[PDB]
Amino acid sequence: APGASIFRCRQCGQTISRRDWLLPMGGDHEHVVFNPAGMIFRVWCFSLAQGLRLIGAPSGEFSWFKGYDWTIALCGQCGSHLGWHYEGGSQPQTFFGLIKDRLAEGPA
């Protein structure tokens, strides 16, 4: 009966990812970053996610992860901005950078 196993959208409960899918990018699953509007984000990297909607075409501008292009990842249900999808890199080719405090962690 684990209580930490899955991540849901904090705003609506949409199923998004699992603890098992945490990815230590550059040796840490957590990355503390800011965007050009100076917003600070505690980003958890996941190899896999579901229930998102990826919007727009990938951009390399201001990428926090060298060699990766990002798209905005919204909650596919409620439209909450949950993070970004990263692609175009190597090892891994793709992953998700999700904003920790926008997810709720709990049992399956």
Partner: peptide, 4 residues
């Protein structure tokens, strides 16, 4: 807003 939502830029990475």
């Amino acid at each position: 807003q939502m830029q990475n």
